[model samples]
Target: SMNELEAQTRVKLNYLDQIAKFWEIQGSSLKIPNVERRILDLYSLSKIVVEEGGYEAICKDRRWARVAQRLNYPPGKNIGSLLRSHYERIVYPYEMYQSGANLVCNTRPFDNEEKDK
Candidate 1:
């Protein structure tokens, strides 16, 4: 049975690994900085949500509601929805791997973080 921290850590590591795998192959491109920034932004947002009291808090907290409302520029209705929409927009390494590309460099910094955890 996983505790809250363990569950949160797993979710964070999953995203980090996915992002790192993608970066391992496509990181040399000119557009990589933007993608990296997006990854970091999402990672930070996840941490903030968890530290503030997890998903339920974000769903019910008034402060979170204000933040979510502000982020609802066009399509997002709430924090969770907005985060999910953003996360799904990111291209995962598995997609590229399935398309006949090899993305197994495995030299991502997140690999170290994963081991540390």
Candidate 2:
């Protein structure tokens, strides 16, 4: 149950989807083909992995923290691992849904730039 909730809420798949949705809606504004392609790939892969049970096996592993750490630190090129860290740190604990203790920021304080302008 915790795994399911963590996977659903803390995996960053939803955040990736939001980004992809925005890119799909405004892709014409982008000046690079690779950017669009990567966005589509991120959206598609995240969709397949999360929705299609790609993470189930890993979640079942007793060494989940180790597996997660590996993913978060990958071997060489490191992008996947970087995203993994984001999920582990910001997403996991935040998604437990504990009332006052689990609230996440929806906004932040404006800086002096806005005030000066």
Candidate 3:
């Protein structure tokens, strides 16, 4: 059962990775004339798609299409700019913290006075 659990997690994670790749391909461009080829995954933030139905109609819950569309944008909202700012201020800093070289809060408050860690 534990082995099944491990296999299940592996299968689930691999499934997620595969679908994200699938979305990036299918959602990017599927041979439409004059259609732009871009990475249009969940991480993507495109006003052209969100606003222009001629391009990306997220009007229907993409779930209705089996996780292929987006929830329509909040009406008259300022999310994009704020979200960009949040990525800069909050997200990137956390990303750097995750990496080894860009360590930010590694020092103990009282450690500065000592010779070694």
Candidate 4:
């Protein structure tokens, strides 16, 4: 059953890849901005989730949880302020990559590039 499911997934992924390739080939003719990179990143993260048995895996990681939870701010609070408080007030050991620090990369390449992108 697992094998069958994996095969189905592969087929679907292949179809999506073909569609993406076709769009790339058509170039500027397509009105839609090329979001293939973001889509691919999402797809890859989804695959990782499935492989690791889902959200539990993501939540279980202490580092991932730390970064992720800080991001889920409440309504009405300026995200920028909350973010500043997170690293500044809490005094997290590592240098934060927020506005205060030099932007190492526009996107966190190691994690998910689509965040900034």
> Which one wins on TM-score?
1
Instruction: Estimate every model's Cα lDDT from 0 to 1.
Output: 0.41, 0.35, 0.32, 0.33
lDDT (Cα, tens digit) per residue for candidate 2, span 59-103: 334333544343343344434444444433333232232212544
Residue 67 error for model 3, in Å?
Answer: 13
Q: Tell me the lDDT of candidate 4.
A: 0.33
TM-score of each: 0.29, 0.25, 0.22, 0.21
Candidate 4, which segments miss by more than 4 Å at Cα? 1-40, 63-117
User: Candidate 2 — which residues are off by over 4 angstroms?
Assistant: 1-42, 56-77, 90-117
lDDT of 2 at 58: 35
Q: Give lDDT for model 3.
A: 0.32
Question: Which pairs of residues clash in candidate 4, taking residues 3 or more apart in a chain or in different chains?
Answer: none
Off by over 4 Å in 1: 1-40, 68-81, 87-117
Top-scoring candidate (lDDT): 1
- Model 1: worst 10 consecutive residues (lDDT sum): 29-38
- C-alpha lDDT (0 to 100) for residue 10 of candidate 2: 39
What digit string (tens of lDDT, one per residue) describes model 4 on residues 29-75? 21212121211122333344334542323333423433323334344
